Amino acid sequence: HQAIAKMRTMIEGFDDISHGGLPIGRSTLVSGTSGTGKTLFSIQFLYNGIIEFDEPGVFVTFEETPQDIIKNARSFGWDLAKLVDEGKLFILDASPDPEGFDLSALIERINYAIQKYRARRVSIDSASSVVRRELFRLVARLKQIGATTVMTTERIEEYGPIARYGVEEFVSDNVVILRNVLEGERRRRTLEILKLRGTSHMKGEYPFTITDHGINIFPLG
Amino acid sequence: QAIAKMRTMIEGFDDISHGGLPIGRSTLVSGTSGTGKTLFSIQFLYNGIIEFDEPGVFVTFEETPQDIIKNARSFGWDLAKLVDEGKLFILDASPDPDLSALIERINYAIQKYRARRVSIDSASSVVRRELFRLVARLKQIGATTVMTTERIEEYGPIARYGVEEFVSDNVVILRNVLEGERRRRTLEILKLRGTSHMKGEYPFTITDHGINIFP
Amino acid sequence: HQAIAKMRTMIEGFDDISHGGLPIGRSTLVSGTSGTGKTLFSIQFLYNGIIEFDEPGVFVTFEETPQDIIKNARSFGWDLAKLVDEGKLFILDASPDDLSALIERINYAIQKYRARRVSIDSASSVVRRELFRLVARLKQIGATTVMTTERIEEYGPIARYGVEEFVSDNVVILRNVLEGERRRRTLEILKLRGTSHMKGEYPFTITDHGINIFP
Amino acid sequence: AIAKMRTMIEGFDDISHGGLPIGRSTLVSGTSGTGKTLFSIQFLYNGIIEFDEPGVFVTFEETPQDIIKNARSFGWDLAKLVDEGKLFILDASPDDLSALIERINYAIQKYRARRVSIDSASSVVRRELFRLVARLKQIGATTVMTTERIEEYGPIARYGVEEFVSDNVVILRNVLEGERRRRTLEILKLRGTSHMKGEYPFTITDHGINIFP
Amino acid sequence: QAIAKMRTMIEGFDDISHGGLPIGRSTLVSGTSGTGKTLFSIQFLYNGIIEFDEPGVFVTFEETPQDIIKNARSFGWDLAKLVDEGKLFILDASPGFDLSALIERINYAIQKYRARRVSIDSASSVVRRELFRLVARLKQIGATTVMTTERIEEYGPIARYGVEEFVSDNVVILRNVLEGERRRRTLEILKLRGTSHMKGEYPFTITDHGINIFPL
Amino acid sequence: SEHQAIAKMRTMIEGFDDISHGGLPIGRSTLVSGTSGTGKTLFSIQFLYNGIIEFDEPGVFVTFEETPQDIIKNARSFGWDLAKLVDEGKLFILDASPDDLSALIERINYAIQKYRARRVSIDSASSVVRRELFRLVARLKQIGATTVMTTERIEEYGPIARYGVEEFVSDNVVILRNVLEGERRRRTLEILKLRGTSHMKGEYPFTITDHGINIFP
């Protein structure tokens, strides 16, 4: 009977901008051009869930190998191997063999892991008619399971389409856009919460930096 | 004997539209993601029920009824209660996790609930033909309808297929323009066939109370 | 210097901009984005001919029903029903629920109703070759014709397929330009073969008396 | 220098440094209502009236009757010129490219014409256009060919090849400045000779095209 | 030894190119209609003959030989005389096309006239392949070649298919841009593999003596 | 510096090791993309040449268009004698230029094993390009090679490479630009991303001279 509740990301600044965190039991699209911090955001969401709340996490990777995910996270001071060893984090490898794709079977394997590891948080990294239907099915199944999910997507322009197929930002309940804008010859990273269905959030772009401690969203407007 | 209007009671809108939405006709409400389309179409029905006891049918193609109900709690509205009382019907035409068939279901619901208001949320040749027929059928039935559509640019095409704004009698455009790192929401009544309305963009906000439009 | 004869539209300001009205016995393309006043222009052309000159007219419609056309015209205080009753106006319904048939139908109505004025509302290679054929036989009848077309940008091609402007004798563009959140309606006579006309855009409004252009 | 024929279109022979190169073809490209047909007609009319140079006008869409009627408002009696055998309007307007070429050739020989106006896949267009230009040359005709374009500052003509195939290229523009239209003419290219460069304003009046260099 | 260059003697160009065109390679010269591509390619051969008694072969696809000759009279160049003397040869390649035959002919002409200089005037995937082949086979002959190509925008892709600038060793862009209602011609050497050149656009005019470029 | 997660090898290209905070990540691939004549080939040759001269690390250069002869001739612009390094067995130029990705990959592997190579330069549907590039990157990684892969782009500001996928499957992305503004060209280099560490951000000016690329951080 209440308006939708939120789970804290504990990503510095983010829970302020979102007025409490990510909407629980829903999926949030996080879209951005190359090297904008999408994998970082997805990982920091699980990592903080484990460390701060003992909420287990599942990370589903479609291209980066688990071993590279674990190695690159040490850049932010995080030991994911340790969390995997303890059974608090599971990295599901859906990356292709370096020798169509069945999202329906993949979903069942994601569910196994969620149940096995008792996970509350899920990150998934990363023809428009077909994209829309398939993305719709995935979002719906995750909701049914009860997971709170970050889903990354790619885009190719800083102030153009939200994602690549012009449908992702309509099927998603929540949309966050990471940008990396070239101003003069300098880059400025910003985060925007474009929409959160059924709840409030701050509007427009907020600058952030990536540091040895992950994402740092500057004190706000 | 010129066309009459039905009040939305959406604060600011009945002013811009000089009395509300043209009765017995369909209004397209187009907008990029998160612009307020669902909210407008829910507030249309909600106010019709609460202010005028005019029952409403909400047709959903993606969002589940459960999520529409949950999301409307953001605004302190209890849509489950209105459904339970028979004032509101949320018609689930979502896909599993035929345009004539859909029309027959909408007609059945309109008769069942004695509804006066409908919201529908949400090749150009085929699209234009199908939309025209949906619009014509709703008119024959007597529905006053809000139909939302998606668009991908704030100052580009009105909707996706470049035809929707031409077969619709009325067109409303919601915008969410990003400038200098800040967003500004606006509402425009682009066209109302056979009647008058204010022109250009009017600022609005979405708060705990729903849509507020400022002239 | 033999002048191309024109017939007065009596649309306020237009006969000034066109130096006497529309070229008689020819077709004028009237193109615009949604809700720019295309149908209004085409109806005002017929209405004024009947009321001012006892020149009967035929309105050919492809999407709006005659009933809605008549209803919307009440916005401007025009009783089109009465004119149809008196055989001064014929609304030809060419709506779905070949071009050859339509043309003979239009020819038939022109002969039957003594009509001098005609309004038609509303792959590029295909459009070009049979838009040209339509112009040719209307000219053969001796009709003076307004034909509306859609376009989707205010400053893009004249009409949707990028050919219509080249096969028409005469071209008029209605714009509804959005700048700084405000809209400005303008009318431009782009071309009138064989005769002079004022150039560029002229602002107009749509009010209770229809189109008012300010030269 | 190469020999040029005077168009006698006010201002144009100055911009082209003496007129159009004889025996060569000139593209005249513009958006709708920019004056392409007018330029075409004036080129023939002046050749006849001033220089007793007969002309052939080839039309693909506008009918001969309309061309004549439309010219009348400039005070030009084309029917009279057709009656005297000084002008031939060749109707190719609708209900073989080689068949048209031999129709043109035949009319040129028959009327002893020195001036021609033709109004109006990339691979095949370029191929078919190059073929047309190539044969007019062999004949010795001096030709104006109009083409359509859809933007004032954009490709020269509809298919992005026309300007590369033609010896000479003239662009007629009709540009919006604020809400006002301004007509200009530009000679982009004239192979083998000098010309004035850039855009020059013109008006269309009761006396045809008037360009101010 | 780094790649050597041969002087074009086109005024200002040898300064911009730091010595002329790289020997034994092809230079792409691209530009919109009427930018001076043919004139650059002719002036290259004409100066070859006049200044260095280096015979030249001009390969034409659009213009007839007769028109090439007539159009150069503008500049006081008597190409008819150069053809009569056997110093210039104009190879007519005007109208299922495939490159392999044309090369024999070019080669034929090159040894026949003892030519040092060549000018060729004028699916992206196939264009890239076929251009690559032409460039390679010309290189095998040892010819120094100017090959012109079209583009449709002053500040867009180097050439028409978006691949020509990548397979060419050297690239020169001629522009004809609107300044007000006036035109400004400029020449840019975009790239010369394995050697140096000045950067950016340099204005030029076309006069009764052909191309005149001002580097300073 | 020390407190970063990913080991790097120095390019010894003036200024680049500063911008990349230590050089190119070892055992990984770096995309180097740029319009025509931006310096892609020079960068990828300079990478190998410096590896050999400074650290006696052998390199393999894979060329898909330029012939070995021309690669060698063009490098003389900079005073580099690549023929001598090829004679000495320190450099191998693999000629894959025209008169099967799997066969190519096996050639590369064979050369890398045969020449004991530590540095590799490769010069130069969307998701068929994507999965083929992905495959290529994965295999070089399993070998342990550190790779520079150049790609083309057609606008200075616009897509990173031709197919809009190359920048997402690469671990590291460098963009070379050659911007024309007010009739003048200025060259810049940008490291857009390096997975797993920091790096200087934005564009940095550079020149190409008789000494190769000189970048000013």
Ligand SMILES: Nc1ncnc2c1ncn2[C@@H]1O[C@H](COP(=O)(O)OP(=O)(O)OP(O)(O)=S)[C@@H](O)[C@H]1O
């Ligand atoms: N209580 C609230 N206070 C302020 N804003 C709110 C509140 N609840 C929701 N919103 C806003 O309403 C937006 C959602 O509005 P919707 O009507 O769902 O938009 P939409 O255009 O239908 O988007 P789709 O269908 O997801 S593309 C959220 O993104 C919030 O910005």
Ligand SMILES: Nc1ncnc2c1ncn2[C@@H]1O[C@H](COP(=O)(O)OP(=O)(O)OP(O)(O)=S)[C@@H](O)[C@H]1O
């Ligand atoms: N009494 C009135 N006062 C002022 N404006 C009016 C009045 N009645 C109608 N209008 C305007 O006229 C417009 C309708 O013009 P139409 O001629 O129907 O446009 P249209 O170009 O034919 O649009 P289509 O066919 O729907 S794309 C409406 O959108 C109103 O803005």
Ligand SMILES: Nc1ncnc2c1ncn2[C@@H]1O[C@H](COP(=O)(O)OP(=O)(O)OP(O)(O)=S)[C@@H](O)[C@H]1O
């Ligand atoms: N007597 C006149 N006085 C002034 N302007 C005139 C006169 N007669 C014609 N015009 C103008 O000339 C224009 C037509 O010129 P054309 O040469 O027919 O144009 P066009 O470029 O051939 O256009 P098309 O073929 O219709 S796309 C008309 O649109 C008028 O603006």
Ligand SMILES: Nc1ncnc2c1ncn2[C@@H]1O[C@H](COP(=O)(O)OP(=O)(O)OP(O)(O)=S)[C@@H](O)[C@H]1O
């Ligand atoms: N004597 C001259 N004085 C000045 N300009 C001249 C002279 N002769 C020719 N021109 C100019 O040179 C231009 C022709 O140059 P070309 O080299 O033929 O151009 P192009 O780039 O090859 O064009 P194409 O192949 O027709 S697209 C003409 O358009 C004139 O502007």
Ligand SMILES: Nc1ncnc2c1ncn2[C@@H]1O[C@H](COP(=O)(O)OP(=O)(O)OP(O)(O)=S)[C@@H](O)[C@H]1O
């Ligand atoms: N000695 C030198 N001094 C200065 N600049 C030079 C020197 N040698 C070469 N250059 C420059 O280096 C550029 C070539 O760089 P490359 O590395 O071949 O470019 P690229 O990006 O690989 O271009 P492609 O493959 O031809 S698209 C030339 O265009 C010259 O500007």
Ligand SMILES: Nc1ncnc2c1ncn2[C@@H]1O[C@H](COP(=O)(O)OP(=O)(O)OP(O)(O)=S)[C@@H](O)[C@H]1O
């Ligand atoms: N310790 C650190 N300090 C500062 N910046 C860092 C640090 N570690 C990594 N980065 C930055 O993080 C970026 C990578 O972030 P990711 O989250 O991998 O981006 P991404 O959007 O997932 O990019 P992809 O998937 O390769 S397209 C690098 O390009 C660096 O700029």
Ligand SMILES: [Cl-]
């Ligand atoms: Cl940062």
Ligand SMILES: [Cl-]
């Ligand atoms: Cl708001």
Ligand SMILES: [Cl-]
């Ligand atoms: Cl108005």
Ligand SMILES: [Cl-]
């Ligand atoms: Cl004028």
Ligand SMILES: [Cl-]
């Ligand atoms: Cl000049």
Ligand SMILES: [Cl-]
């Ligand atoms: Cl430099």
Ligand SMILES: [Mg+2]
């Ligand atoms: Mg990532």
Ligand SMILES: [Mg+2]
């Ligand atoms: Mg919605």
Ligand SMILES: [Mg+2]
């Ligand atoms: Mg209409």
Ligand SMILES: [Mg+2]
């Ligand atoms: Mg014409």
